[PDB]
C-alpha cells in the first residue's frame, strides 16, 4: 500500500512570500516520516508541477528544512498579488493539489 | 380597425441593447409604433428607493439613438414606459436628458411628451384613511409610518395617459412608471384595434425577444395586430416564435395566466389559442378584456441601513465540511471583541457551491470541492457595517478550526481591498392598489426638443 | 542587569482583536515590552496605493486602549510597526489620531515617538540612476516611469530607528513601514540580548497566536529571551505552543527558512532547535544573525484603472455545464453592442464552486450543483467599468444558452443593486532593495501626548 | 412506467410575480403529454412542498393553463425581493427541485 501525505503531515498549506512568490509548507508529524520522504526522492519538481498544471522548471526550489522536519516548495506567483485577474491575494488557499499526494513506500 | 398595426419592441428593457442588423430588418417591416419597456420592479427596491437606474446610461443612449432617429425619420411614434428603470421623477429626468443629448448630436427636432407617475405622500395617507388602499397578495397592510418613511412613490399608469399625449401630436412619449403592456397597446387601441388583443400582444412583447426561442433579453420582436388576432415574429435567423415561447411569455412573471390584471381591467385568456404560422412565427387569438373599477398600483421603498461586504473562496475540504460551525464561532468571537450588543446588526452569509442560491430550500446538503463565501453586514450606519465586516473578515481569515492543516490563512480574496462598502440598503414598503381619483390623474407635458435644447 | 527579556505580542495585526482574559493573563507575566505589528503587504496594493487601512479604526482603537493603558500604567514601552496597515504618511497619521483620542478618553499623558518611512521619489530616481536599486526575486526591473507613477513609497525600517526613539525616552513608539521582527527585537537587542535569538523570537511572534495551535489571528503570545534561547507561551488554556507550531511560524511567509533576510543582515537558522518544555511551551535556540551591507526594501503601487463588479449564483445544471462558452459568448455580445475597442477593458470571472480559487491550476475540472459567478470589470474610467459591467450583467441574465429550459432569467443576485462600484484599482509597482544612504536615514520625532492634545 | 418531467417539458423555470410571490412555470412540448400529466393527478402540492422543504399549505395555487399546455405553481416568497438576507432578488433560479420529478404512468 501507499502512504498519503495527509497521513504523514501536521501542516500542509500555502501563503505568499511577498507579492511575487507562493510558498507551500509541509511540516511532518515525525522526524522518521520526514527522513523516509526525503530519502525516497519521490517529492520532485515534476510531481508538484503536474499537480499544479505548471512546467517543472516553474518550481523554483524545494527546500528540506531539517530543524523542523519540514519541506518548503517555492514557485513565482503567475499573477502578482492584487493584480487585475487575481484569485487569491494573500496566496492562502493554494494547497489543495498537495492533498492527493501518496508515496510509494 | 382595418388590415394591421405593427409594433416593434427593440429590446427587453431599454438599455439592454440589440443587434444592429435585427433593428434594421425590423424597420424594413415598416412598424407603425416603436415601443419599449424601460423599467421593472424585479431588480429590487434599491433603484426606486435611491432614485437610480438599474440600466446603463451609455446603453440607454445607444438604444435610444437607433429608436429616435428611426422614429423621427419615418414619422413613427416612439413610446417608452417606466423611463429610467423605475419611472419616478429622477428616473424620468435622467432619461429625458439622454434624449436631449441625442437630439443635439443627431441634429433632430421633435415633440416629446413627459408623463410623470410620482404620487405625493399626502394622497396616499388620505387614501389609506378613506379605505381606498388594498394590499396585493401576501403584501402587509399599509401603515402611515410606512408611507411616511418611503422615498419616491410611483403609480403604474395604463393606456389612457399615453393616448392623450399621442393625440396631442407627441412624436416621442416618455412615460414614468407604467403597466408594461400599456406602452405597446395604447396607440393601436386609440386607432380602433381590439383592446384585449392589443393588451395581450403588449404582454407578449413586453420583453421583446425573451418571448422568442432561444430567448434574448437583447433582441427585437414585432407583433402585428389584425382584427382577429396578432402575429408574432423576430428578426434574427437564430430565433423563432413558437407556441411554447409565446405562451411562456403570457405566463411570464404573473400569478394567474388565465387572468392578467392591470389598470382599468383584466385580460381573460380562457379562450386563447396559440398557433404556429408562416416560418418561425405565431398567431395568437381569442384574448378578451374585462373592464374593472379603475385602480392603480403604487410602489415605494424605504431605507433600512448600510451594507459592507466581502467575498473570498475556500478550497480546503476540512474547512468546507465544518463551515457552518466555523461561521457561528467567528460571529461569536467578533461580537465579544467589539462588544456588539445591537440586535439591528445583520450578518448574512452566502455559501456559493452549497446553498447560496436557495438557502434553506436547497435540496443538496453537501458542498463540493470549493465554496465562494460572500459575507454582508447591514447595520444602522456605514461605519458599524464596515467595522463588523472587517472583523469578521480578519477573524475568519485566521480562525483555527478543528483539524486545520492549512494554517497560514483560510481565505482566497479576489480583490484588494477585500471589503466593499456598498452603501444604503432599501426594502420595499409600498406595493398596494389605490382607487383612482382626480388627484391621481397622470398629466402629460410636451416640450419641443431641438439640436440646441428645448425651444419654447 | 536582567537575565530575561519578556515580549508580549497581543494580536497578529493591530486591530484584529484578542480576548480580554488573554491580555489580562499576559500582563500578569510582567512583560518588559508590549510590541505589535500593525501592517503587512499581504492584503495587496490598494492599501498602500490609496493611503487606506486594511484594519478597522474601531478595532485598532479597541486594541490600543488595552495596550497603551497597560504600558503607561506599568512603565512598559509599547512599540508598533507599520502603523495604520501600510505605514506610509497617511497610515501613520491615522493611527496617531487614534492614540490621541485614547489619551483624551483615558486621561493619560505620555511621550510618543513617530518614525515615518516615506521616501521621496527623487531619492529613488537618483538611486536607480546610480545603480543602488536591486529587484527582489521575480520582480520586474524598476524604471523611472514606474517610480513617477507610484503614489506613496515606503522603506521597511529595521531595529535601529526604534532603538533611537526608545533611547530618547519614548513610552510609545509609532513606526511607519517596518520589518516585522524589528518591532519586537529592537529593545532586547539594545539591552544586550542576542541579536539572532531576538530577531528569531520577533519572527515567531510577528503574528502572535498564529504561531500557537490551534492558531488564532486574534490571541496573545509571549517570548522570553534568556542567555541561551527563548521560550514561547500562549495565555489561553485552549492554545499551546508546539515544536511544529513554532517552527511553522519560522517558515511563515518566507522563501527560504534557512536564511531570513532583513535590513542589516540575515537570520541563519541552520543550527536552530525547537524543544517542547513545561506545559504547552517551546524553547528555541541556535538562531544566528549575520550582518550584511545595509539595504532597505521599498514598496510602492500605482493606479491602473477602476472596477465595477457583480455577484450572482446559478443553480441550473445545463447553464453550469456550458458556463465557459456562455461567458465567452456574453462578452462577445457586449463588445459588439457597446462597440468596445480598448484592450485595457478587462473582464474577469470567478466561478466559485469550480475554479474561483485556483484558476487554471485547479485540479478538479467539474463543478457541482451550484456556481457563484463573480464578475468584475477594470477599465480606464469608472464610467466605462460601470457600463461594461452593467451590460455583461443584463446580457448574462437573459442569454439564451443551448438547451436552456429555465427561460425567465439565468442569475440569482443576492443584492439590490446588483452591481457594486468598487473604485480605483492599484497594482504593485515597487518591490526593490535600495542601498542605505544618509538620505534614507529614518528620523524620529517625539511629541508629548496629553488629555488635551499635543501642545503647539 | 417511470417517466421524467425533464423528458416532457420544454420549459421548467422560476421567476418572481412581483416582490412577494414566486412562480414556477412548466410548459410541455405536447398537449398529449400535458394532458397525461394533468389527468394523472400526480403533480400535487404535497409533491412540490416536499421538493422545496416547505409545508403543503405553503403552496398557494397550482394552475393548469390548458391553452398553453402549461402548469404554473404559485408560492409566496419567504424573503421579499431585495430584503436583507435575500438569495435571489429576481426569483430566477429557484427551479432546480422540479428537475427531479418522475411520474409513474
Ligand atoms: N391596476 C392594477 N391592478 C392590479 N394589479 C396591478 C395593477 N397594476 C399593476 N398590477 C400588478 O403589477 C404587475 C405589473 O407588471 P408589469 O407592468 O409587467 O411590471 P414590471 O415592469 O415590473 O415587469 C401586474 O402584473 C399586476 O400583478
Ligand atoms: N532589507 C531587506 N533586505 C532583504 N529583504 C528584505 C528586506 N526588508 C524586507 N525584505 C523582504 O520583505 C519581507 C518583509 O517581511 P515582513 O517584514 O514580515 O513583512 P509583512 O509586514 O509584509 O508581513 C522579508 O521577509 C523579506 O523577504
Ligand atoms: Cl468616470
Ligand atoms: Mg417593466
Ligand atoms: Mg413586466
Ligand atoms: Mg507585518
Ligand atoms: Mg510579516
mmCIF file of N, CA and C in Angstrom, chain B residues 381-421:
data_model
loop_
_atom_site.group_PDB
_atom_site.id
_atom_site.type_symbol
_atom_site.label_atom_id
_atom_site.label_comp_id
_atom_site.label_asym_id
_atom_site.label_seq_id
_atom_site.Cartn_x
_atom_site.Cartn_y
_atom_site.Cartn_z
ATOM 1 N N UNK B 381 -25.414 52.315 10.572
ATOM 2 C CA UNK B 381 -24.511 53.258 9.937
ATOM 3 C C UNK B 381 -23.494 52.497 9.104
ATOM 4 N N UNK B 382 -22.932 53.193 8.116
ATOM 5 C CA UNK B 382 -21.898 52.576 7.296
ATOM 6 C C UNK B 382 -20.678 52.223 8.144
ATOM 7 N N UNK B 383 -20.353 53.057 9.135
ATOM 8 C CA UNK B 383 -19.177 52.791 9.965
ATOM 9 C C UNK B 383 -19.318 51.480 10.723
ATOM 10 N N UNK B 384 -20.499 51.225 11.290
ATOM 11 C CA UNK B 384 -20.711 49.984 12.026
ATOM 12 C C UNK B 384 -20.648 48.788 11.081
ATOM 13 N N UNK B 385 -21.318 48.889 9.925
ATOM 14 C CA UNK B 385 -21.245 47.814 8.942
ATOM 15 C C UNK B 385 -19.800 47.525 8.539
ATOM 16 N N UNK B 386 -19.007 48.578 8.338
ATOM 17 C CA UNK B 386 -17.605 48.396 7.981
ATOM 18 C C UNK B 386 -16.837 47.674 9.080
ATOM 19 N N UNK B 387 -17.040 48.103 10.315
ATOM 20 C CA UNK B 387 -16.295 47.560 11.475
ATOM 21 C C UNK B 387 -16.574 46.063 11.665
ATOM 22 N N UNK B 388 -17.843 45.660 11.598
ATOM 23 C CA UNK B 388 -18.234 44.272 11.774
ATOM 24 C C UNK B 388 -17.731 43.439 10.605
ATOM 25 N N UNK B 389 -17.924 43.942 9.379
ATOM 26 C CA UNK B 389 -17.450 43.197 8.220
ATOM 27 C C UNK B 389 -15.935 42.990 8.278
ATOM 28 N N UNK B 390 -15.186 44.042 8.624
ATOM 29 C CA UNK B 390 -13.729 43.929 8.706
ATOM 30 C C UNK B 390 -13.306 42.882 9.732
ATOM 31 N N UNK B 391 -13.916 42.905 10.920
ATOM 32 C CA UNK B 391 -13.538 41.956 11.963
ATOM 33 C C UNK B 391 -13.971 40.531 11.627
ATOM 34 N N UNK B 392 -15.142 40.348 11.007
ATOM 35 C CA UNK B 392 -15.490 39.007 10.546
ATOM 36 C C UNK B 392 -14.471 38.511 9.529
ATOM 37 N N UNK B 393 -14.110 39.372 8.572
ATOM 38 C CA UNK B 393 -13.140 39.011 7.547
ATOM 39 C C UNK B 393 -11.812 38.571 8.164
ATOM 40 N N UNK B 394 -11.231 39.390 9.047
ATOM 41 C CA UNK B 394 -9.909 39.035 9.563
ATOM 42 C C UNK B 394 -9.986 37.871 10.539
ATOM 43 N N UNK B 395 -11.096 37.746 11.265
ATOM 44 C CA UNK B 395 -11.268 36.626 12.184
ATOM 45 C C UNK B 395 -11.438 35.316 11.431
ATOM 46 N N UNK B 396 -12.280 35.313 10.392
ATOM 47 C CA UNK B 396 -12.438 34.114 9.576
ATOM 48 C C UNK B 396 -11.135 33.750 8.881
ATOM 49 N N UNK B 397 -10.379 34.756 8.435
ATOM 50 C CA UNK B 397 -9.131 34.515 7.709
ATOM 51 C C UNK B 397 -8.173 33.647 8.513
ATOM 52 N N UNK B 398 -8.119 33.851 9.825
ATOM 53 C CA UNK B 398 -7.119 33.170 10.639
ATOM 54 C C UNK B 398 -7.734 32.284 11.713
ATOM 55 N N UNK B 399 -9.004 31.919 11.550
ATOM 56 C CA UNK B 399 -9.675 31.102 12.547
ATOM 57 C C UNK B 399 -9.095 29.693 12.570
ATOM 58 N N UNK B 400 -8.746 29.236 13.768
ATOM 59 C CA UNK B 400 -8.144 27.923 13.917
ATOM 60 C C UNK B 400 -9.192 26.845 14.093
ATOM 61 N N UNK B 401 -9.827 26.442 12.995
ATOM 62 C CA UNK B 401 -10.870 25.436 13.069
ATOM 63 C C UNK B 401 -10.286 24.062 13.387
ATOM 64 N N UNK B 402 -11.154 23.168 13.841
ATOM 65 C CA UNK B 402 -10.680 21.871 14.296
ATOM 66 C C UNK B 402 -10.071 21.081 13.149
ATOM 67 N N UNK B 403 -8.921 20.470 13.417
ATOM 68 C CA UNK B 403 -8.197 19.634 12.464
ATOM 69 C C UNK B 403 -7.580 20.413 11.307
ATOM 70 N N UNK B 404 -7.507 21.742 11.399
ATOM 71 C CA UNK B 404 -6.918 22.524 10.318
ATOM 72 C C UNK B 404 -5.472 22.114 10.063
ATOM 73 N N UNK B 405 -5.144 21.892 8.790
ATOM 74 C CA UNK B 405 -3.756 21.730 8.366
ATOM 75 C C UNK B 405 -3.234 22.899 7.527
ATOM 76 N N UNK B 406 -4.102 23.712 6.933
ATOM 77 C CA UNK B 406 -3.699 24.870 6.125
ATOM 78 C C UNK B 406 -3.719 26.087 7.040
ATOM 79 N N UNK B 407 -2.631 26.260 7.780
ATOM 80 C CA UNK B 407 -2.642 27.092 8.976
ATOM 81 C C UNK B 407 -2.172 28.528 8.756
ATOM 82 N N UNK B 408 -1.860 28.933 7.516
ATOM 83 C CA UNK B 408 -1.387 30.296 7.264
ATOM 84 C C UNK B 408 -2.494 31.265 6.881
ATOM 85 N N UNK B 409 -3.719 30.777 6.719
ATOM 86 C CA UNK B 409 -4.819 31.608 6.263
ATOM 87 C C UNK B 409 -5.887 30.754 5.630
ATOM 88 N N UNK B 410 -7.138 31.202 5.743
ATOM 89 C CA UNK B 410 -8.296 30.377 5.388
ATOM 90 C C UNK B 410 -9.053 30.842 4.144
ATOM 91 N N UNK B 411 -8.656 31.957 3.526
ATOM 92 C CA UNK B 411 -9.498 32.636 2.539
ATOM 93 C C UNK B 411 -8.699 33.132 1.343
ATOM 94 N N UNK B 412 -9.281 32.975 0.143
ATOM 95 C CA UNK B 412 -8.728 33.490 -1.110
ATOM 96 C C UNK B 412 -9.555 34.697 -1.547
ATOM 97 N N UNK B 413 -9.042 35.886 -1.313
ATOM 98 C CA UNK B 413 -9.752 37.098 -1.726
ATOM 99 C C UNK B 413 -9.392 37.418 -3.169
ATOM 100 N N UNK B 414 -10.365 37.714 -4.026
ATOM 101 C CA UNK B 414 -10.021 38.154 -5.384
ATOM 102 C C UNK B 414 -9.551 39.594 -5.478
ATOM 103 N N UNK B 415 -9.863 40.450 -4.500
ATOM 104 C CA UNK B 415 -9.641 41.884 -4.663
ATOM 105 C C UNK B 415 -8.816 42.464 -3.532
ATOM 106 N N UNK B 416 -8.121 43.549 -3.865
ATOM 107 C CA UNK B 416 -7.541 44.477 -2.908
ATOM 108 C C UNK B 416 -8.246 45.793 -3.222
ATOM 109 N N UNK B 417 -9.034 46.372 -2.294
ATOM 110 C CA UNK B 417 -9.260 45.931 -0.917
ATOM 111 C C UNK B 417 -10.225 44.765 -0.870
ATOM 112 N N UNK B 418 -10.198 43.999 0.231
ATOM 113 C CA UNK B 418 -11.079 42.839 0.358
ATOM 114 C C UNK B 418 -12.504 43.244 0.674
ATOM 115 N N UNK B 419 -12.703 44.351 1.386
ATOM 116 C CA UNK B 419 -14.029 44.786 1.805
ATOM 117 C C UNK B 419 -14.569 45.850 0.862
ATOM 118 N N UNK B 420 -15.870 45.771 0.592
ATOM 119 C CA UNK B 420 -16.542 46.656 -0.354
ATOM 120 C C UNK B 420 -17.705 47.336 0.364
ATOM 121 N N UNK B 421 -17.657 48.665 0.449
ATOM 122 C CA UNK B 421 -18.725 49.445 1.075
ATOM 123 C C UNK B 421 -19.767 49.705 -0.003
#
